[model samples]
Target chain A: SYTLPSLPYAYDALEPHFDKQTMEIHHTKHHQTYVNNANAALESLPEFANLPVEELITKLDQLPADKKTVLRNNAGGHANHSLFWKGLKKGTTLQGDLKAAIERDFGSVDNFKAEFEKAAASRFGSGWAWLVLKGDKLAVVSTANLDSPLMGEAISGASGFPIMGLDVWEHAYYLKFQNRRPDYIKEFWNVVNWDEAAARFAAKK
Target chain B: SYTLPSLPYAYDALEPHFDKQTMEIHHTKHHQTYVNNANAALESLPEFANLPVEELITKLDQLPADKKTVLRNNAGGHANHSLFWKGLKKGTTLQGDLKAAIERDFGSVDNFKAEFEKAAASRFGSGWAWLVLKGDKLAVVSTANLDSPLMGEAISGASGFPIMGLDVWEHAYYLKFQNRRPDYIKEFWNVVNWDEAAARFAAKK
Candidate 1:
């Protein structure tokens, strides 16, 4: 059975950018809920127990219709919160191949920020904006509900590997930023785990 | 220039069921955002200016593809929130044609509650669960994101006039209920405006 991962830092460590209360609740309540529900969903389908969470989400079509929604939402929730915790740190600096790629593909870091923030702000409802690798080129993609980049192929055949993602669900910021999501997106830049992002990019490539 | 409507009761009116803080933020921040956006989206199209918000959402196919998403979400947001506020009040008693209709259609009022609660709980991500009228029958339906029962014809060709709806969006309950949405759904029963529901049923039928 899967378990909620331990956050690398204290809940208040990302404070000012991400508040202490939001982080604590998000980790202990929201993330734990997802882990528990994901485990419950998997328990109902023991025949597919051998598959990884990411694999299970990608191959959701293989699951029965009765069970697919449960797995998709819970597994996606688990996967997303796990990655979300990793994508944040107290401080960060973008450098090396990842920086060069951002410059080459997006023209400049500011441009990438603008595009990414637009993706996040324009999402309308609960979703994520992602930096993903689509055929070795960096592209920005957004998915609705609990959908993730990992499920791209199974969803439509358009595929990518997610480098990092920003959760735009209201629960991510409503406690602190309220209705001003653009403010939350602006502040999120300060805590991004650029080192982890770079490592994911290099490893995936 | 659409405007945010004043809440029918004070923010604290719903008390233990719906808290003051959530109500204030939900009405002033979340619902206001939708009104501002809907007005902004309308600024681009002059010919559609004379149309009512419900009419605009129902006939969204006539809109340009680029404008459709913005208008669908914001316009639906405005209409849904407007109805949502009306659908709630401090005290209510179900009676008359609405009660009889619910019993005739859904077996009994308790069964209807079970069905409605199930719809509210089962909706994934941010959306609404509605009790609407399809011809003379009461049916429960759900829509994803800011889509509404008003969009029934556009989305599925099955039209239903909305009687009342519950906002299943996290913003609707996350503050007080957190991950315990079933708790929120349970408490929602105490504040449901059955009189307004009956009026809507009478008007639509």
Candidate 2:
């Protein structure tokens, strides 16, 4: 099966926020393992393999038990990282209406960063932090494991177009952020694409 | 302690979609009981009595053992029903852009409803089905009881915005839907507030 989405940014680009060794391992080893395993699982059920990635995403429960864990973890990881890579752009600072909006809604971008960090730090376990556009409002919401706002029943009282997201999974940040997830969370504000987020907001009906 | 929120819809309003007795018991008994218990738990602590509701939601894991059960079960029940009530508006239909969006995303509204009902049916235990906006898309996700997309370290993956929700907890449907939870899930489509959902969609930043 063709898998292993190419990284949009060089492994070192995320440095300071994440280390190169960590990204390399996370992608090539951990992520690749999931992909390889998913393929192997599908090997036994060629018909399932024929489905689109999107279809597999919604029907992950259909994978037989022997291959369930592989399909779920790896396929989920692959799909997640595929989106994560596209959602990020390096050296892209927060600007445009998002800057002014942050000031209006959260007092200041720094304050928003603080709250965002607090949300991520207090997450307790694996999840992701998001900057999403709900109409004209931007709010932060989190989701656990391979789950995201993508799953409707997974969250209550939330709906939005995601402009930016930060993965707080131990696997995503463990080697770099370690126990100091807050620091990583704080730094993430710098690389955020507020302009893109604004565009997402503008594009939504 | 006073408990139970006022139902946004009349008891008999839901009619065949939701039987009158079920609505009465669900509101006055089940949901109200939770509200009462949640208040009693809060009242037990003079120091914390005046704390904000958001505080209770954000700091859910830290409640003392005595209050924990109250907070987890009753607060959960109360909060769930509170949203569930508003989610269901009488004399409404899933029409307009939301209907189109559902068709575009999930083949058709019936398919989405069928898939959702299937999820509600397959949930081995208690939970809810949700329709959320995710990454410029929509998807269905199910979460276990008192466990909302808002709380816990579990569901922070895609950072979703909730549009519509349905409760599949046996307590939610037992008196009426009985063990045939599928019936209840299917009926939920009848009264779903598509306008509210469309508002949520348009508001996505």
Candidate 3:
């Protein structure tokens, strides 16, 4: 089992926005379980061991039928939590193209944040908000449950690496945000790893 | 299994936007499956036989603990589709306090609709959009899967009746809309059952 990826900072390091206990459970219990489940599922199917986890999810039904459900759920959990953990960090803000895109598409940084929050906060159930480099543009899109934007059709026809993601599942925040997922969505920006986003934006194409 | 509700309009009624074939499959195949699955779950649980289906769902954990998953998935499916079928119709439009509330909260009736479409279009997965009455105000909310504002903790706090709802799930639009979920949302206004919405609003406190 892949252990919970050590957070870039201490649990409290994200502070009031993402509380310590929430962070602890989110990583140790939640993400660790996904990785462990995914590794176990892969053990029974050596052919799937070489595929990227996200790709396995996108092609879920093709997994020899009997292995489909386990691969879908576990692989999805592994890929999603891996991205969810990396998309967040203690400090940093938008820069370069991502910053430019926010201003261009959503008016201002605050406006972009508000629009992003509106999307993340308004998500009806388990989901995540993604900032990805789609072609020459940086776009913010969301996916529900253990879905990754990488797992489905690219609507805008622009694809890029994911930089940041916010998990809006009740499990991620119900202990603190409870029914106020919006409040948790607002705080997510406080710990956003924009520097990482920029690097992702610059990587590859 | 509950029967498929009759369409509010003739198959050809929503032409120029929604084709007749799309409506038939959506209403019959898609909506009916959810209804049957939901009813089947309820039949499997004897303890819930006396409770209002909606009320039984409100306290999901209290349902036969063994049947909680089945109920949440299928019973949730049942209640959501029951409301969705009634919430749409032919040539419906906003009126009176419903109109006033839309204006007050969302800037204008048209804006409220556009924002609603934006919510529906942007929903990353199977879900529904609702114009719900809260106290004396109307608010727009969307829920994923079979989630209703009344179902889970996500947006049930308003304790209001849903006036109008649009189902944006792929099954609701995929045959025609394909990846164009936004277009399906845009066309839904033509059949919003405003008469029913007005009655719901007038009866509200």
Top candidate on lDDT is: 1
Model 2: CA > 4 A from native:
A1-205, B1-3, B44-55, B62-69, B152-159
Chain A vs. true chain A, TM-score per candidate? 0.95, 0.73, 0.85
CA lDDT, candidate 1, residue B20: 94
* Candidate 2 residue-wise lDDT, B1-205, digit = tens: 4445687768998887887876776677667656776787887776666654434654666767666655655565665677778777667667777788889999987788778777777654346777877777888877766555555544322236667778875556655544456677778777777777777777863
Candidate 1 accuracy as lDDT: 0.87
Query: Chain B alone, model 3: TM-score?
Result: 0.84
Best model number under TM-score: 1
lDDT of each residue in A45-132, candidate 3, tens digit only = 7877778776776676567777665555557667777766677776586778868876876788887777678778655445677766
Worst 10 residues of 2 chain B by lDDT: B150-159
- Worst window of 10 by summed lDDT in candidate 3 chain B: B152-161
Give TM-scores for every candidate, taking all chains together and pairing residue i with residue i: 0.94, 0.46, 0.50
What is candidate 1's CAPRI-style docking category based on DockQ?
A: medium
